[PDB]
Amino acid sequence: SKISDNYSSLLQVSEALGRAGLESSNLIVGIDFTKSNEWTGAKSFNRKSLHHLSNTPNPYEQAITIIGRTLAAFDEGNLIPCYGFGDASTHDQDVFSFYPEGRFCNGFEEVLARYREIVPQLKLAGPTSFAPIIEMAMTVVEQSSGQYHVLVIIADGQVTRSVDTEHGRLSPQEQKTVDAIVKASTLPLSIVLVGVGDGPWDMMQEFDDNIPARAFDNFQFVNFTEIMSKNKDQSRKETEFALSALMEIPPQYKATIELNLLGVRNGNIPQRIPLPPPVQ
Ligand SMILES: [Ca+2]
Ligand SMILES: [Ca+2]
Ligand SMILES: [Ca+2]
Ligand SMILES: [Mg+2]
Numbered sequence: 001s002k003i004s005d006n007y008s009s010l011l012q013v014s015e016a017l018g019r020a021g022l023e024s025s026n027l028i029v030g031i032d033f034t035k036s037n038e039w040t041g042a043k044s045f046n047r048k049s050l051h052h053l054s055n056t057p058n059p060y061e062q063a064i065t066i067i068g069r070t071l072a073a074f075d076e077g078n079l080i081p082c083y084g085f086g087d088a089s090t091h092d093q094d095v096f097s098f099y100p101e102g103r104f105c106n107g108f109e110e111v112l113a114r115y116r117e118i119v120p121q122l123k124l125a126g127p128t129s130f131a132p133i134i135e136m137a138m139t140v141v142e143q144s145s146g147q148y149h150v151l152v153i154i155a156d157g158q159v160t161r162s163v164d165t166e167h168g169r170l171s172p173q174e175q176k177t178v179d180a181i182v183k184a185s186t187l188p189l190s191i192v193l194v195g196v197g198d199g200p201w202d203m204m205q206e207f208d209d210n211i212p213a214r215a216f217d218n219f220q221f222v223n224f225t226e227i228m229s230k231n232k233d234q235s236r237k238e239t240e241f242a243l244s245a246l247m248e249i250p251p252q253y254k255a256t257i258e259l260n261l262l263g264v265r266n267g268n269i270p271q272r273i274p275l276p277p278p279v280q
Helices: 010-020 059-070 107-121 131-143 172-184 202-209 224-229 234-246 249-258
Strands: 026-032 082-085 149-155 189-195 219-223
Touching: 010 234, 010 249, 026 131, 059 107, 059 149, 059 224, 059 234, 082 107, 082 131, 131 149, 131 172, 131 189, 172 189, 172 202, 189 202, 189 224, 189 249, 202 219, 219 224, 219 234, 224 234
Parallel strands: 026 082, 026 149, 149 189, 189 219
Antiparallel strands: none
């Protein structure tokens, strides 16, 4: 079924996870390095690229930071695989790992630093598909033999489509991404989409709420730019991000149990190999 917002506070989600008996989880990070990032900051980031580095934090950095402050507990070893995608070296075909021989990030401090070290060495390209980052997360979950993971994707949300067409028919990047979201539901994987820039967000909301062919609701959408733009403290913006990020975790974790996915190896998950980072 489709999972509504069933928690109105951060504490409520805590308690549901407590009743759910969650003992173990890990995180995987995916970052959109597609070229749309250069204009999806028109309204929300002062006509600067969403990946532009300067004296002020860009929205990817804010997301990397807020994520580190709020969601940290959900990676049991503070060791996080990270992956870029959409850059010139992977296009809509591959991902690349943040580090040469697979090595993971030591906490989100490193994710922020490694992100800073990397993004201006990149050619932002495309097209935009989520199929490779999601298939990479699948391989990850499959190799740990069914250990529960949450995939956090930070992206401007503009998966490649055509403007008109209004067909309601899917581009190749739309079909491969949807086919991935459906395939991922045969594994203990939660997907969390952290959306930055101006949007529009109608596709991300479709991924969140309306993907009939999947076995359970495995996708959540977070409008980061909405949460940040609001009228309140920095504290309460972080609580709000965390509630939004975690809103579907308890149902989805229970689904991985009731659908027999947790700790179960699927056996039909193709082994995706990440590319090394295209950097120095
Ligand atoms: Ca981990
Ligand atoms: Ca959902
Ligand atoms: Ca939702
Ligand atoms: Mg794009």
